[PDB]
Amino acid sequence: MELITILEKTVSPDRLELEAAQKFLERAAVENLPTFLVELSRVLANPGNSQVARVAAGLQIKNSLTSKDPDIKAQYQQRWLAIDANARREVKNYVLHTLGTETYRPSSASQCVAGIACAEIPVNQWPELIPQLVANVTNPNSTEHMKESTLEAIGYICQDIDPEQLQDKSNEILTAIIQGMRKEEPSNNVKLAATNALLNSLEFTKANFDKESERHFIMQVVCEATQCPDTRVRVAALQNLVKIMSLYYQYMETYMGPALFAITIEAMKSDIDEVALQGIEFWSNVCDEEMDLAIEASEAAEQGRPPEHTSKFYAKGALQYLVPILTQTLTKQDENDDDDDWNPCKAAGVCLMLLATCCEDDIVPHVLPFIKEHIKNPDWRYRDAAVMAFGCILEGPEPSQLKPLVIQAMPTLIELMKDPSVVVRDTAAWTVGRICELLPEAAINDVYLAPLLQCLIEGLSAEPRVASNVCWAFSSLAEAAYEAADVADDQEEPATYCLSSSFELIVQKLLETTDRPDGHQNNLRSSAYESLMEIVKNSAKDCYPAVQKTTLVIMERLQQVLQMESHIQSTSDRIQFNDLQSLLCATLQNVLRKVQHQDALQISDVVMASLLRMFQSTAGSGGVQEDALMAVSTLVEVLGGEFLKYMEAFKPFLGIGLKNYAEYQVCLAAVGLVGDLCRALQSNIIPFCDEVMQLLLENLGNENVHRSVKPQILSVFGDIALAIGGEFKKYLEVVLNTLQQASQAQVDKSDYDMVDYLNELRESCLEAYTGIVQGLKGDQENVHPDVMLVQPRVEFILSFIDHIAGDEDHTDGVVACAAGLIGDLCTAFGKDVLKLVEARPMIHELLTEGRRSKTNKAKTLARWATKELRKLKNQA
C-alpha cells in the first residue's frame, strides 16, 4: 500500500484496521529505520498532504526518538545517533523546514525537533538548530504559526534536555523567548508559547540572571506579561514569577518593593481562579524559601558562622496585607465539595498555615479578629472560614501563647461539632484534630475531654467528609493521651490513661465505621483503619482486653478477604479489594507488635497461611505484596527463631519478591524481609543464603532496577555476614568488589536529589563493611582468623571514609557509621590501622566533628572511636 494511505488508517476507530496499519509501520521501521524516518519526514514536511497523515507521520517520528521510559529513551537516542549522518541530515531539514507550515494547532514538527535535539545537542551534532529557531522567532516578517511552532519547539527542548547541556546556549535561547514575550507582539498565542518556553528554561539561565543588564530585561518582560489581557499569558507569567522567586530569591530585593508585591497581591484578589491560585502560590513559596533560610541561619549559627544566604523576611512584611486577603478567600468554599480539586479556598488555607509556621506569633494578632467576628456568623461560609483560620494558625506560634486562646475556644468548638452545615462540621473536626496534635493539654482536660469524646464518637456516624476527619482527630487524640500517661510510670507502657474508660466504645465504633457501605468516599475506610491502628498501638495496659478481642476480629476479616474474589466485577472492584488487603495487613503489622509473645504464637500459623495465599493468587498490585511482606517481617520479628517452621514453604515467595525488581517497593520489602530473617534465624539461615545472595547479586547487576534498591541490598549484605559469620567467606570476594565499586560512586554536588542519595549509598557501604568486619571476627577473643581476609582492603575503606570527610555534604548518619567503622577497625587489626589513620588527616576532623554534633549517636561513636585509636597509640 501507500505510506500516506496507511498513516491515515491509524485514525480509524476500528481495532483491526489500527492494528494492521500500526504493524505495517513497526515493520518498516525494523527493516530500514533510516529510510523509514526519511519517508515520514517527507510526508510531515509536505503541506499538500492531509492534516491526518502529517500528524500521524510526526507521531511515528517522535515515537522513534523518545519514550516515557528513560531506559527506552536512551536506547532510541543512541539508535538514532548510529544512523548515517547523511540520513539524519535529511530528516533534520525536513523537520525544521516544517516549522510554520502546519495549520494543525499543536505542532507535530515541534515534538520531532525536540526528540532529535535531545539526542544531537548533547554532542553538538546539529549546530544549525538554535540559530534557526532564533531566526524564526526574531525575523520581523515571520508568520504567527512560524513563531508559535518554533517557540513550542524551544519549550519542548528545555523541558526534555538536561539543563546542564543547554547552559551554553541559554544566551540565544533567551533572546528568542524574550522576543516572543514582548508587549508589542500581535499574537497572544505567540506570547503564550514564549512565556511557557521561559518557564521551562529558567533552570539553565543562572549565568544570565547574574548580569543585571539581562536580569532587568527578563524581569520587565515578565512583569509586563502579567499585565496582558489574555488570561492565559497572565497565568503563565505569574508562574514564571513563582519559579524565579524560588531560583533567584537573592536577587529579588530589587524588584519586590517596586513591583512583585503589587502584581502578586493584585492576583490574589482576582475573581479568576487560575489567577488567584498563582498569586497565592507565589507567597506560599516565599514562606517555604524563608523557612528554609531560617533553618540555614539556625544551622550556621551553631557552626559559629554566617549563613551562605540570608532571608529578607518578605512574608513577615507582607503579613498585614496577605491575611485580610487570605481569610476572605476562605469564604469562597464550594458547597458541593470535590476533595480532589485545588481551588483558591483550599490554597488560602494552606498559605495561612505556611505563614503561621513562617512568621510564628506575628500572625495571631492579624488572624484572631477575623476569627472572633465570624465564629458566630449565621453565614456558614464565614463561620467555616473562621474555624479553618483558627485551625490554620495552631502550628508556629509559641504554645504558651496559644494554649489560653485554645482553652477559651473549646466551648464554641464543641458547639461547632454539631453545627447544621456539613462544611462547618468537616472543618471543626479537622480543627479538633489539630488541637489534639499540637496543643493537647487543651483537649486532655478534666473539663473538655468528656464532651469532646462524645462529639467525636457521634461524628464517626456522620457524612464521609466529616467522619474521615473525625477518624484522624481520634488517632491524634490517642497519641497525645498515650504520651500524657506514661510521662513517668517507672516502666514500659502506662498502667492506664484517660481513654481507658471508653477504649472499647471507640474501637467498636471504628470497626463499624470500617464497614460503612460509603467507606470509599473521602478515603473514609482507610482513615477508619489507620485510626484504629493508632488507637491500638497507643493504648494503656488495662486496654489489652479489648485489644485481644480486636485482634480476633482482625483475623476473621482477614479470611473474609481470601474468599472475596467473587464480588470483584468492575475494575474499581479489584482496586478497592486490594486496598482492604493492605489495610488488614497493615493493621496486622500493628497488633503483632502489641500482643504478648505468647498470644502471637497461636495467631502465627493461621496468619502465615493467610499471608501465604494472599501472595500467590494476587500477583497483581504490588502495594498488597508490599504490605503482605511487611506483615511477614512483623511476624518474623515476633516469632523469632521459631519462624523457621515456615521458611521451607515461604522460600518461593521470598524469591519472587526479590526477582520483581520492576516494583522497587515490593523488592525493598523483600530485601527488608531478608534482613529480618537474618536477625531471627541467625546461622539457621545458612541453607537459604545461596539463593538470596544469587538473587541479590543479580538485582545489582541489572542497572534497570530502581536505584533505591542498591543501598538496601548493600546494607543487608552486612546483616547476612553477621548472621552466618564464617560461612560468608563464600561471597566475600564478590561483595567487597561490589562494595568497592559502590563506595567510589559520586554524583553532582549540586543536585540535592543525589546529594542526599549518595549519603544513603555511603551509609549502606559503611554499614556493610561494619557488618562484614564484625561477622568474620567471631564473637569474643582477639581478632579471629577470618577478618584477616579483609586486612588488605583496610586501606581503601579508610580512603573511602577519608574522602567522605572531605565533601562537606555528609550527614550525621554517615559520620556516625564511619566513626563506628574506624572503631571496629582498631579492634580488628590493631596497631596497624593507626599509622593509616594519622596519614589521612580528614579522618581526624571527622571524628572531631562527631564529638561535637548534636546527634548523640554521632557523638557516642565519634567519642568511642577516638578512645579506641588512642588505645592503639598507647599500646605497642
Binding site: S284, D340, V350, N469, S526, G675, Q774, G823
Partner: protein, 44 residues
C-alpha cells in the same frame, strides 16, 4: 503549584501511609541494629 496534599487530611492517602509505614520500619531496624552493635563494642 498544587499543595493539595497539605490541605487538611487529603495528603494522608494510602500511598503516603504505606511510605510512612516503611519509614517506621527502616528506623526500627536501625534501633535494633544500632543497639546490637553498641552491645558488642561496649559503649554508652
Amino acid at each position: 503549584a498544587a499543595r493539595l496534599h497539605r490541605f487538611k487530611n487529603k495528603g494522608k492517602d494510602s500511598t503516603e501511609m504505606r511510605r510512612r509505614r516503611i519509614e517506621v520500619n527502616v528506623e526500627l531496624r536501625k534501633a535494633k541494629k544500632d543497639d546490637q552493635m553498641l552491645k558488642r563494642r561496649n559503649v554508652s
